[PDB]
Amino acid sequence: DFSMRPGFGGPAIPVGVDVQVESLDSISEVDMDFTMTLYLRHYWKDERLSFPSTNNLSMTFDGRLVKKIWVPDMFFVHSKRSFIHDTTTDNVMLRVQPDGKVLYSLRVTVTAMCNMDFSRFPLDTQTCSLEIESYAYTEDDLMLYWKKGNDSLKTDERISLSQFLIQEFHTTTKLAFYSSTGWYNRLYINFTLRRHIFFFLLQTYFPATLMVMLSWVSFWIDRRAVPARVPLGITTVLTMSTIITGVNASMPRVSYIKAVDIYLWVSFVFVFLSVLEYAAVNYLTTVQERKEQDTHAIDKYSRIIFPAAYILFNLIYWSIFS
Amino acid sequence: DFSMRPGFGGPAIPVGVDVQVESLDSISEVDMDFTMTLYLRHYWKDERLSFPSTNNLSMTFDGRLVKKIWVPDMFFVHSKRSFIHDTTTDNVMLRVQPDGKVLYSLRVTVTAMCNMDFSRFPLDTQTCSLEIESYAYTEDDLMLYWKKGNDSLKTDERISLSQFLIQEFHTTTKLAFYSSTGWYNRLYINFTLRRHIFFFLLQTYFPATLMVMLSWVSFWIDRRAVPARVPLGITTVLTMSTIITGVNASMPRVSYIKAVDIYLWVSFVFVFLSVLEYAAVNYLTTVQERKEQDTHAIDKYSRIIFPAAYILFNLIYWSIFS
Amino acid sequence: DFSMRPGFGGPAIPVGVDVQVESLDSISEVDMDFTMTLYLRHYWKDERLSFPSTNNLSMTFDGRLVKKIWVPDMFFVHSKRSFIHDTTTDNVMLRVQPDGKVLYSLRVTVTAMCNMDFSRFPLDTQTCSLEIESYAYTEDDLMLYWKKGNDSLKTDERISLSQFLIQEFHTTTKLAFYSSTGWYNRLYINFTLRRHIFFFLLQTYFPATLMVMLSWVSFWIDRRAVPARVPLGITTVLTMSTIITGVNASMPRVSYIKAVDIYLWVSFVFVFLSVLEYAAVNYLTTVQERKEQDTHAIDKYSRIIFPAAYILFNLIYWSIFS
Amino acid sequence: DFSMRPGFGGPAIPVGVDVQVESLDSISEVDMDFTMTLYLRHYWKDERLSFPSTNNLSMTFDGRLVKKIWVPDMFFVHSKRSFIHDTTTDNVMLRVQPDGKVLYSLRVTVTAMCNMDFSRFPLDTQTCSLEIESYAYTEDDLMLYWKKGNDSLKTDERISLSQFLIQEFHTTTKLAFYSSTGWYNRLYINFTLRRHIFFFLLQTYFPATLMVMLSWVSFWIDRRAVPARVPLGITTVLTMSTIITGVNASMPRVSYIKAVDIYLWVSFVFVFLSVLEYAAVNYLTTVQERKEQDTHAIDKYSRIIFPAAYILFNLIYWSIFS
Amino acid sequence: DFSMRPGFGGPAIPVGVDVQVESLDSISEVDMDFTMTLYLRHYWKDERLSFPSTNNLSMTFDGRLVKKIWVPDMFFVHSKRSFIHDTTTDNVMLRVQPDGKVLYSLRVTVTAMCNMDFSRFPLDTQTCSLEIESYAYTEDDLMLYWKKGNDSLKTDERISLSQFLIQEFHTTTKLAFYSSTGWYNRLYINFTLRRHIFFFLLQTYFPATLMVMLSWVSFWIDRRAVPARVPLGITTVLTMSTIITGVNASMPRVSYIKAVDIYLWVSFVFVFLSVLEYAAVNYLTTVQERKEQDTHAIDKYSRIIFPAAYILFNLIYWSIFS
Ligand SMILES: Cl/C(=C\n1cncn1)c1ccc(Cl)cc1Cl
Ligand SMILES: Cl/C(=C\n1cncn1)c1ccc(Cl)cc1Cl
Ligand SMILES: Cl/C(=C\n1cncn1)c1ccc(Cl)cc1Cl
Ligand SMILES: Cl/C(=C\n1cncn1)c1ccc(Cl)cc1Cl
Ligand SMILES: Cl/C(=C\n1cncn1)c1ccc(Cl)cc1Cl
Ligand SMILES: CCCCCCCC
Ligand SMILES: CCCCCCCC
Ligand SMILES: CCCCCCCC
Ligand SMILES: CCCCCCCC
Ligand SMILES: CCCCCCCC
Ligand SMILES: CCCCCCCC
Ligand SMILES: CCCCCCCC
Ligand SMILES: CCCCCCCC
Ligand SMILES: CCCCCCCC
Ligand SMILES: CCCCCCCC
Ligand SMILES: CCCCCCCC
Ligand SMILES: CCCCCCCC
Ligand SMILES: CCCCCCCC
Ligand SMILES: CCCCCCCC
Ligand SMILES: CCCCCCCC
Ligand SMILES: CCCCCCCC
Ligand SMILES: CCCCCCCC
Ligand SMILES: CCCCCCCC
Ligand SMILES: CCCCCCCC
Ligand SMILES: CCCCCCCC
Ligand SMILES: CCCCCC
Ligand SMILES: CCCCCC
Ligand SMILES: CCCCCC
Ligand SMILES: CCCCCC
Ligand SMILES: CCCCCC
Ligand SMILES: CCCCCC
Ligand SMILES: CCCCCC
Ligand SMILES: CCCCCC
Ligand SMILES: CCCCCC
Ligand SMILES: CCCCCC
Ligand SMILES: [Cl-]
């Protein structure tokens, strides 16, 4: 009866795992998941599978035999969807040796949930993992381990992504507990991710800075030229508002506060204050004309104060986000 | 014949349910649904499943036995789509004890319809539920209950969402009736949802307020400077219209009136009225010049009246939506 | 042989239908279809299904028996896609009575084609239907009818949609003909749909109207102030063009002429004419100065003529679309 | 052995086809394909299927018999995806007559590749086709033809599309050759498509034309009014650029040159030239003032030359695209 | 036992491949993959499949026989998803000759990963490939080759794409190694891709260039006209910012630096510098008036220097990207 595991009732059966990674097919920021294609290999010794031959060499069967014999039942923990490839036929392999050591191999694609924090965007780093576990059998019945330690993971040379950079592949293990079912062995495949920083500096942190620098030109124009100093500021407000909407249309769409939002909103406040400045100046000059019937003090102070505050802002901001 | 339930013809069979929640995979606002992955467990006593062993301990089978024996038929009420995971094999478990107490377990993902009201957006709170029912059998044949009361629900520590905050998981039960079929027992899994308010305050309720404040600067400029007071107002109208279209491009897309729409439209009316104000002033000054051949009264009254009305608006608005 | 219908060769077998509607899952305007989840019930009398019991009460089987016995073959006319739910097992029920009266029940989701006319958008009303027919058997072999007349349809209390309002559920029947196959009986489920009008009035018919009102302010400014009357009109053109593009980005995307398009284009023409007006005025004043070396007549006539024409436009427009 | 065709080894078996079209479900411009739902019927005479009855009338089986007997193997040439409907059961019909004439019928949806040329957009016309072929058997084994000539195609009265107009359904046949396999018979279903022209005239060819007409107003304003003639032109440039981006956001997205692109770019050049015109005029007047210390000739020539060139452009353009 | 290959234990079985390409269904730039539909053919000699007939001619079976006999197990290396077509029945063919030479044929669609570099966009060229391999058997058991060399690939005459141009189809072979499994034979189908350059020149490299040319007009306007030279520059900044956001909304969405980005950002810097220029000029004139109580030198130098620098930029840029 190939429904009972090898060594039933006695000690747990040692099953060993080997993995090779093919590709990383996609990543979704809004749904917080990633998709991967890999090869998965198993090993064990079963005597009901022995045969009399002198060759001392393995012999090959396929998926049809897999539905007759007994086989492990690993599954992917914290997955959203997976499948096994089937063209032009099932991507399954089964090799059987004279002494009874089986090898069993699959090709699969998995989508796995990854929790991500965007508060430092775009200067963040994300960490993700793939988890492997047996579904039905506890650690007293089935024992699970990496076949050759840290060397039981292999990775493909052309694995790439359009939005990210990948580094630091390694394996770990950990024991897990379910309250209604027991203690299970679990294996992990970990890696790290990062973005192209110097592109975001030019896409977002550059136009805003130029706009704030453009609002300071007003302090050097003659206060007598009202039809020239009034339209300049409000057009500058318009430009900055347009920019803040273009950046939002090109970003992934997240609804809590991010690093880049802070910088843009502060630049906006600097440009709004410049408009209030000249309104004060105009009003004071006008009441002086009325009272009686050279650069203004507020102009020659603004020319110093505004840039220095912006410089202080930048120092603190980049001390916090580094 | 494992087509007749245990206890056929006599009294109803008691079946008990246990649940553990894995993840919340996605939420759709336009279609009004959510997607969830969970583990589902059942329990009962059947004597046709007894076997002679002294061990007083459970013994394990899998999905192939499930197609031979009799098994409950629960289903998900008010679901749009669901499925059972099958890699690397069916995520199914079956454990059978010497006295005949069966345990049966599945891994599944469900999308369930949730009715939502957006009239208070973005200050709303949404309530959603998952419902479990037997398809074929009434309460006189099958009896359904939570195995250990309020403690029959377990939830994962890293359950998270990018747009929402989750709280208040608990269980309830209720009897249900179909007119052509009878009375059935139903179980419920309830929870609550909310948004990040202080992000929306800065994304939407901040730029508009600054714009209305910018339209008030006009009352302090000299009425003699026509080429300076005329372009200011119409450029301010342009800026506010641009803003009202950016917010609409970044929101989920709903076609009845929402809280945030009201605030934006009222700000728009304030800016339109400021333009009509100076047109009155200009016309009156001009006819005075013609008649005959200092700040105007309407200017020095507007400087008080406009801000006070806006303050009254804000008081009432936040008294209504709190 | 359960491949021959009950009453083969003699008279047609009467089969009766009962329906209960669960939810309306989605609607697509571009592809012209809707998606629905319902319960579907059948009834008939078959003697090969009789059994000797005294109970005078029905007894329950499930989907496995359905593959052995004979069963109707209804299908959904003018559907694009459908399916039967299968978690945690097939959503199928079969109840069999001592005298041989079978009851058979399914849970299904269907997407059905609905032809829609958008010429009156957004003041339109759409009518849609679900059609049920037997695939293989003509009216001389199988007879199909509603079990209890108008009362054979039941509907759920919380059926809702985010963009529409639903009303007027009722049933009808009609005989249908295929040229290569014969006459068949058909059943229908009809209902009506409508939009939230007073939201569209504020989203689209309000900003344009304010813009046209803003273009009339120019007639009251002094014709001597050229740098003040020239930029006003062209900025107003810019604002109206921006608005006409935002509305188009927020609508469903249809490529023939709709009611709302007409109103927007007419407003655009009014604003373009205002610019041509002042160009005439300026030119005439200038040639007068040249000839020789008070309000202009065209100004004081425009102040009356423009609003009156707009009022005439609105009267006719709302007499046509009501 | 129902694996050998009727008439094996001798002459080819005549199989006849009949078709009725239900709906046209969708069209994709970017991927260049369309999706269709239809009924497909076959006919032939097989003697291994004869039975002794006097009725001289056909008798009905279904899909389960289809898996036992022999049946044709038609397939859809140049399809991307297809399927057969299966709710509430397989949409399959089989009718068998006393003399052995079989009728066999299916309901299916197909997506078929259609090659399209967009160079004349939006004044184009597209032609598409559906192709039917036998997969395994050459013209010496299986003979394929339309059952009743041009009358073997039927079409539904409410077939409609939201973006197109459909006309000219007819059938054709053609012999085809594969180099590694042989000569096969092929059947075709052809039709024609077109757009709503007079909507595109108003959506795209109208605003641009008004803008070019607005740039000509500048020639009639007094050259002495620099602060009035300078902002007019550059604001007009801004408006035209905005328009050219809105049209691009509402079109299907194709990356070679189209008819409508040409018209928009030429209008853009006309508006840019108007700005250069006044710059010349201003410079010449200024140097005249300097030299010494009425309408300008370039103004009164532009008033004639610009409109006449635009009229010439329109004549040629509509002579080419008609 | 048709589970052992022909020639088991002795020498490897020679299997030969032939391919014909139907269509190229789609391409995704963000996910870096392409989708293809093709016919795939195999050949070999097996004696357990011989039959006694004099005809010296092949005889036809179908997919049902394929599940009984032994058959190769090729698969698609570096694929994301594939499938075999099944309407109206499995697209499978099997022809068997008196001497035992089998022919076996399939119709399939595959999506295959293609690594792409966008740094030269839009002047890039991409190279892609399709790879074929045996899953279970090494080169000592199964030998794989192209049936007729370079002539074993055929391609369809109407293969086309909406965004690209296709050229250079040819075949290659290469031996491959897996560390846990052995050496395998691999076949390749290669081709080349390119874009429509002269469309992108007009869509992107034309408006920016005109804008930079428009910013140079300012050097020829009289420095005394402040209300005419100040609004011109800031409106030009606004126009250029708008343009840079429209291009980004119409491109595929990639997050590292591309060729076209560089050109746009440099144009932006030229327009910002023009505004700073007149601010210097105005300030110097004003202090001169104050000191004392003709074209400026910076104006007549700018008129030469700005265009020459832009010309130098273009020379270098097109020397680098050619
Ligand atoms: Cl971010 C934005 C506008 N939005 C664009 N899309 C959605 N909201 C905004 C927020 C704060 C401030 Cl200070 C200025 C601006 Cl313009
Ligand atoms: Cl909300 C909008 C424009 N739209 C943008 N997308 C769709 N409509 C609008 C509505 C009312 C008022 Cl008072 C002002 C404006 Cl700008
Ligand atoms: Cl509706 C549009 C521009 N488009 C925006 N998206 C696509 N086209 C338009 C059409 C006619 C008139 Cl009179 C004015 C305008 Cl602005
Ligand atoms: Cl069509 C476009 C801008 N784009 C908008 N989306 C993508 N590019 C443009 C092209 C040529 C000319 Cl002469 C003027 C303009 Cl504004
Ligand atoms: Cl490209 C962009 C704005 N963005 C539009 N969408 C996203 N960012 C920008 C970047 C650099 C410079 Cl110098 C100018 C501009 Cl306007
Ligand atoms: C979490 C602090 C946000 C501060 C935003 C300030 C915007 C001017
Ligand atoms: C709105 C501007 C008011 C300026 C007042 C300045 C008083 C010192
Ligand atoms: C932000 C500028 C403040 C200038 C204050 C000047 C007081 C004399
Ligand atoms: C939540 C961190 C806010 C940091 C603000 C920094 C302002 C310079
Ligand atoms: C339901 C009341 C809506 C009021 C909208 C007012 C817009 C100015
Ligand atoms: C359009 C402005 C008219 C202003 C008239 C004011 C009469 C008191
Ligand atoms: C909204 C301002 C009204 C001002 C009225 C002044 C009447 C003298
Ligand atoms: C439907 C509620 C409208 C509330 C309007 C509040 C205006 C201050
Ligand atoms: C079908 C009549 C359309 C009229 C459009 C008029 C646009 C100014
Ligand atoms: C382009 C404006 C011309 C105005 C001419 C008016 C002649 C009565
Ligand atoms: C649309 C306004 C026309 C004004 C005509 C005035 C003729 C004296
Ligand atoms: C096709 C109907 C056009 C109606 C135009 C109404 C103009 C007032
Ligand atoms: C194929 C000719 C294109 C011409 C484009 C001209 C744009 C000004
Ligand atoms: C940039 C404008 C220069 C105009 C020069 C005109 C010489 C006839
Ligand atoms: C495009 C207008 C050209 C005008 C030339 C005038 C030469 C005196
Ligand atoms: C490729 C056709 C170009 C036609 C240009 C027509 C310009 C009037
Ligand atoms: C990799 C060099 C980028 C240079 C960008 C310059 C933008 C002004
Ligand atoms: C912000 C403009 C300052 C110009 C100073 C020029 C000194 C030579
Ligand atoms: C970019 C223009 C520089 C002009 C310098 C002029 C120095 C006299
Ligand atoms: C990474 C290549 C940068 C090339 C810059 C060229 C500037 C002319
Ligand atoms: C905004 C500056 C105000 C200065 C008041 C003296
Ligand atoms: C004259 C003060 C200049 C300040 C520059 C930061
Ligand atoms: C808009 C203010 C009008 C005042 C009339 C006296
Ligand atoms: C002079 C009146 C000022 C009012 C500020 C709200
Ligand atoms: C646009 C008005 C023109 C009037 C001609 C007398
Ligand atoms: C003086 C005429 C006013 C007209 C208002 C509609
Ligand atoms: C742009 C017109 C220039 C005329 C030179 C005489
Ligand atoms: C005075 C010339 C007018 C030309 C109109 C096309
Ligand atoms: C921007 C030009 C400055 C020149 C200083 C002499
Ligand atoms: C007078 C100098 C002109 C320079 C044109 C590039
Ligand atoms: Cl001025």
For residues C159 and C87, membership in a common domain is answered with: yes
- In whole angstroms, give the CA distance from residue C37 to residue C24: 7
- In whole angstroms, give the CA distance from residue E155 to residue E163: 20
- The two tokens of residue B158 are 């890293």
Q: Which residues contact A312 (CB under 8 A, 6 or more apart)?
A: none
- In whole angstroms, give the CA distance from residue D192 to residue D167: 5
Contact across the interface for B136 and C22, Cβ inside 8 Å: no
Distances (CA, A) of B176 to B173, C37, C175, D210, D215: 10, 19, 37, 66, 72
- H or E, element range at A13: strand A13-28
How many C-beta neighbours within 10 Å does residue B33 have? 24
- In whole angstroms, give the CA distance from residue A245 to residue B245: 10
C78 — alpha (psi -120 to 50), left (phi > 0) or beta? left
Specify whether the CB–CB gap between E256 and E119 falls below 8 A: yes
From the number of C-beta atoms within 10 Å of its C-beta (0-12, 13-18, 19+), residue A33 rates as buried
- In whole angstroms, give the CA distance from residue C233 to residue C228: 10
Specify whether the CB–CB gap between B88 and A106 falls below 8 A: yes
**Nearest C-alpha neighbor of D116 from the set D130, D105, D127:** D127
Q: Which residues contact D112 (CB under 8 A, 6 or more apart)?
A: D33, D34, D35, D36, D76, D78, D79, D80, D128, D129, D130, D131
**Nearest C-alpha neighbor of B87 from the set A35, A145, A76, A24:** A76
Largest Cα span, chain C: 122
For chain C, the first-to-last Cα distance in angstroms comes to 64
Amino acid at E79: S
Across-strand partners of B36?
B24, B110
For chain E, the first-to-last Cα distance in angstroms comes to 64
Q: Which residues contact E205 (CB under 8 A, 6 or more apart)?
A: E260, E263
Q: Is the dihedral of CA A214, A220, A222, A223 positive or negative?
A: positive
Query: For residue E135, how far is the Cα from the chain centroid?
Result: 28
CA distance E211 to chain D (A): 9
- The two tokens of residue D193 are 């498509």
**Nearest C-alpha neighbor of B26 from the set B36, B17, B18:** B36
Q: Which residues contact D139 (CB under 8 A, 6 or more apart)?
A: D12, D175, D182, D183, D184, D185
Contact across the interface for C25 and B113, Cβ inside 8 Å: yes
Across-strand partners of D146?
D17
**Nearest C-alpha neighbor of A6 from the set A102, A76, A98:** A102
Put simply, the chain A residues between 288 and 317 with a CB less than 8 A from any chain E CB are none
Say whether C3 counts as a known binding-site residue. Answer: no
- The two tokens of residue B153 are 């629900």
For residues A64 and A7, membership in a common domain is answered with: yes
Measured between CB atoms, which of D33, D180, D226 is closest to E228?
D226
User: Where a domain ends, among B171, B196, B221?
Assistant: B196
CA distance E199 to chain D (A): 6
Strands D182-194 and E13-28: unpaired
- The two tokens of residue E222 are 């009289």
Contact across the interface for E88 and D110, Cβ inside 8 Å: no
- The DSSP line for E194-245 is E--HHHHHHHTTTHHHHHHHHHGGGGGS-TT-HHHHHHHHHHHHHHHHHHHH
Contact across the interface for A113 and B23, Cβ inside 8 Å: yes
Q: Which one-letter DSSP state was computed for residue B255?
A: -
Chain D residues inside the 8 Å CB shell of C283: 220-221
Query: For residue D280, how far is the Cα from the chain centroid?
Result: 49
Specify whether the CB–CB gap between D29 and D114 falls below 8 A: no
- The torsion defined by the Cα of A260, A261, A262 and A265, in degrees rounded to 10, comes to 130
- In whole angstroms, give the CA distance from residue A144 to residue A152: 13
- In whole angstroms, give the CA distance from residue C63 to residue C86: 11
Q: What are the backbone dihedrals phi and psi of residue B251, each rounded to the nearest 5 degrees, phi first?
A: -95, 160
- In whole angstroms, give the CA distance from residue B229 to residue B231: 6
Question: From the alpha carbon of B266, which atom of ligand 10 is closest?
Answer: 8
Contact across the interface for A40 and B85, Cβ inside 8 Å: no
CA distance B56 to chain C (A): 30
For residues E123 and E190, membership in a common domain is answered with: yes
For residues A205 and A144, membership in a common domain is answered with: no
Contact across the interface for B238 and C243, Cβ inside 8 Å: no
Half-sphere exposure of A42 (CA within 13 A, CB side): 27
**Nearest C-alpha neighbor of A261 from the set A307, A193, A309, A317:** A317
Put simply, the chain B residues between 182 and 221 with a CB less than 8 A from any chain C CB are none
For residues E126 and E66, membership in a common domain is answered with: yes
- In whole angstroms, give the CA distance from residue B118 to residue B115: 10
Residue list for the binding site of D for 4-aminobutanoate: 41, 105, 133
Q: What's the full length of chain A, in residues?
A: 322
Which segments within chain C are labelled E, that is strand?
13-28, 33-45, 59-61, 74-77, 79-84, 92-96, 101-113, 126-134, 142-146, 153-155, 165-178, 182-194
Query: For residue B104, how far is the Cα from the chain centroid?
Result: 32
Q: How far, in Å, is the centroid of ligand 30 from the Cα of C274?
A: 11
Residue of A nearest to B220 (CA): A283
Query: For residue B96, how far is the Cα from the chain centroid?
Result: 41
Mutation site for E-interface testing, chosen from D30, D37, D70, D75 by largest number of E Cβ within 10 Å? D75
- In whole angstroms, give the CA distance from residue D128 to residue D35: 12
**Nearest C-alpha neighbor of E267 from the set E203, E320, E228, E214:** E214
Residue in the structure block whose two tokens are 């014709």: C223
Half-sphere exposure of A322 (CA within 13 A, CB side): 1
Residue in the structure block whose two tokens are 């969970």: B38
State which residues form the domain around D121.
Answer: 1-196
Q: Which one-letter DSSP state was computed for residue A105?
A: E
User: Where a domain ends, among C174, C196, C218?
Assistant: C196
Contact across the interface for A180 and B41, Cβ inside 8 Å: yes
- The ligand placed nearest to the CA atom of residue D308 is 33
Instruction: Count up the domains in chain C and report the number.
Output: 2
Q: Which residues contact B309 (CB under 8 A, 6 or more apart)?
A: none
- The two tokens of residue E269 are 């810097």
Specify whether the CB–CB gap between A197 and A125 falls below 8 A: no
From the number of C-beta atoms within 10 Å of its C-beta (0-12, 13-18, 19+), residue A267 rates as buried
Strand order in the sheet with A74-77: A74-77, A126-134, A182-194, A165-178
A57 touches chain E (CB under 8 A): no
Amino acid at B293: Q
- In whole angstroms, give the CA distance from residue A132 to residue E193: 40
User: Where a domain ends, among D196, D219, D247?
Assistant: D196
Angle between helices E259-292 and E207-215 (to 10 degrees): 10
Specify whether the CB–CB gap between C24 and C128 falls below 8 A: no
How many C-beta neighbours within 10 Å does residue B100 have? 15
Q: How far, in Å, is the centroid of ligand 13 from the Cα of B211?
A: 21
From the number of C-beta atoms within 10 Å of its C-beta (0-12, 13-18, 19+), residue C148 rates as exposed
Specify whether the CB–CB gap between E200 and E321 falls below 8 A: no
- In whole angstroms, give the CA distance from residue B240 to residue B265: 10
Distances (CA, A) of A42 to A17, A146, D286: 5, 10, 89
**Nearest C-alpha neighbor of B29 from the set B255, B276, B306:** B255
For residues B273 and B312, membership in a common domain is answered with: yes
Half-sphere exposure of C59 (CA within 13 A, CB side): 19
- In whole angstroms, give the CA distance from residue E107 to residue C108: 32
Specify whether the CB–CB gap between E206 and E197 falls below 8 A: no
Specify whether the CB–CB gap between C211 and C236 falls below 8 A: yes
Residue of B nearest to A104 (CA): B88
Q: How big is the CA angle at A112 (ends A110 and A118), to the nearest 5 degrees?
A: 145
Residue in the structure block whose two tokens are 């209720």: B174
Chain A residues inside the 8 Å CB shell of B198: 257
Residue in the structure block whose two tokens are 């060397």: A151
Distances (CA, A) of A156 to A23, A153, A160, D173, E128: 7, 10, 10, 50, 17
**Nearest C-alpha neighbor of B318 from the set B272, B240, B260, B255:** B260
- The DSSP line for C247-286 is HHHHS----S--HHHHHHHHHHHHHHHHHHHHHHHHHHHH
Strands E74-77 and D101-113: unpaired
Question: From the alpha carbon of C204, which atom of ligand 2 is closest?
Answer: 8
A3 touches chain E (CB under 8 A): no
Q: Which one-letter DSSP state was computed for residue E151?
A: G
Residue in the structure block whose two tokens are 């085809």: D176
How many C-beta neighbours within 10 Å does residue C150 have? 10
From the number of C-beta atoms within 10 Å of its C-beta (0-12, 13-18, 19+), residue B236 rates as buried
Strands C153-155 and C13-28: parallel
- H or E, element range at E274: helix E259-292
Q: For a substitution probing ligand 27, which of A303, A305, A306, A310 has the most ligand atoms within 8 Å of its CB?
A: A303
Across-strand partners of B165?
B194
- The torsion defined by the Cα of B314, B317, B318 and B322, in degrees rounded to 10, comes to -170
- The two tokens of residue B316 are 């009432």
Amino acid at E263: Y
- The two tokens of residue C282 are 């300026």
**Nearest C-alpha neighbor of D132 from the set D80, D211, D202, D77:** D77
- In whole angstroms, give the CA distance from residue B296 to residue B282: 10
C239 SS3 class: helix
Measured between CB atoms, which of A82, A255, A276 is closest to B195?
A255
- In whole angstroms, give the CA distance from residue E80 to residue E113: 7
- In whole angstroms, give the CA distance from residue E285 to residue D231: 23
Q: For a substitution probing ligand 4, which of D238, D245, D247, D255 has the most ligand atoms within 8 Å of its CB?
A: D245
Specify whether the CB–CB gap between B21 and B153 falls below 8 A: yes
Interface partners of chain D (CB pairs < 8 Å, 3 or more) are C, E
* SS3 labels along D112-126: EECCCCCCCCCCCCE
Q: For a substitution probing ligand 11, which of C218, C220, C274, C302 has the most ligand atoms within 8 Å of its CB?
A: C220
Across-strand partners of A61?
A94
- In whole angstroms, give the CA distance from residue A278 to residue A217: 12
For residues A131 and A28, membership in a common domain is answered with: yes
Put simply, the chain C residues between 238 and 267 with a CB less than 8 A from any chain B CB are 238-239, 242-243, 246, 249-250
Specify whether the CB–CB gap between D80 and D112 falls below 8 A: yes
CA distance D238 to chain E (A): 6
Residue in the structure block whose two tokens are 């609004």: E231
Could you check whether the bond before residue A87 is cis, i.e. omega within 30 degrees of 0?
no
Q: How far, in Å, is the centroid of ligand 8 from the Cα of A233?
A: 18
How many C-beta neighbours within 10 Å does residue D266 have? 15
Specify whether the CB–CB gap between E213 and D274 falls below 8 A: no
Residue in the structure block whose two tokens are 């420095």: E223
Chain B residues inside the 8 Å CB shell of A73: 62, 88-89
Query: For residue A134, how far is the Cα from the chain centroid?
Result: 27
Q: How big is the CA angle at B26 (ends B24 and B27), to the nearest 5 degrees?
A: 110
Angle between helices A226-250 and B207-215 (to 10 degrees): 170
How many C-beta neighbours within 10 Å does residue C223 have? 18
From the number of C-beta atoms within 10 Å of its C-beta (0-12, 13-18, 19+), residue A179 rates as exposed
**Nearest C-alpha neighbor of A228 from the set B80, B225, B252:** B225
Interface partners of chain A (CB pairs < 8 Å, 3 or more) are B, E
- The two tokens of residue B239 are 């800026």
- H or E, element range at A107: strand A101-113
Query: For residue C245, how far is the Cα from the chain centroid?
Result: 24
B117 SS3 class: coil
For residues E188 and E209, membership in a common domain is answered with: no
CA distance C52 to chain D (A): 30
C48 SS3 class: helix
- In whole angstroms, give the CA distance from residue A146 to residue A136: 19
Chain D residues inside the 8 Å CB shell of C272: 210, 214
Amino acid at E24: L
For residues C161 and C221, membership in a common domain is answered with: no
E311 SS3 class: helix
- In whole angstroms, give the CA distance from residue A156 to residue E209: 44
Contact across the interface for B232 and A227, Cβ inside 8 Å: no
Measured between CB atoms, which of E18, E91, E232 is closest to D180?
E18
- In whole angstroms, give the CA distance from residue A9 to residue A25: 43
- In whole angstroms, give the CA distance from residue A220 to residue D36: 69
Q: How far, in Å, is the centroid of ligand 13 from the Cα of B125?
A: 19
Specify whether the CB–CB gap between A271 and A215 falls below 8 A: yes
Chain B residues inside the 8 Å CB shell of A140: none
**Nearest C-alpha neighbor of D108 from the set D134, D79, D136:** D79
For residues D236 and D158, membership in a common domain is answered with: no
- In whole angstroms, give the CA distance from residue D212 to residue B303: 42
Distances (CA, A) of E35 to A22, A91, A307, E24: 19, 20, 55, 6
Q: How far, in Å, is the centroid of ligand 35 from the Cα of E304?
A: 5
Distances (CA, A) of E97 to D137, E101, E104, E148: 15, 5, 12, 20
- In whole angstroms, give the CA distance from residue E1 to residue E234: 84
CA distance C73 to chain B (A): 21
Q: Which residues contact C79 (CB under 8 A, 6 or more apart)?
A: C110, C111, C112, C113, D85
- In whole angstroms, give the CA distance from residue C11 to residue A156: 70
Q: How big is the CA angle at D88 (ends D85 and D93), to the nearest 5 degrees?
A: 60
E6 SS3 class: coil
- In whole angstroms, give the CA distance from residue E244 to residue E257: 14
Chain B residues inside the 8 Å CB shell of C88: 40, 72-75, 84, 106, 108
For residues B21 and B139, membership in a common domain is answered with: yes
**Nearest C-alpha neighbor of A73 from the set A133, A19, A141:** A133
Resolution in A: 2.2
Q: How big is the CA angle at E271 (ends A272 and B239), to the nearest 5 degrees?
A: 35
Q: Which residues contact D277 (CB under 8 A, 6 or more apart)?
A: D218, D219, D298, D302
How many C-beta neighbours within 10 Å does residue E309 have? 12
For residues A221 and A136, membership in a common domain is answered with: no
Measured between CB atoms, which of B41, B199, B246 is closest to A255?
B199
- In whole angstroms, give the CA distance from residue D37 to residue C76: 13
Residue of D nearest to C232 (CA): D232
- The two tokens of residue E272 are 């910002």
- The ligand placed nearest to the CA atom of residue E298 is 24
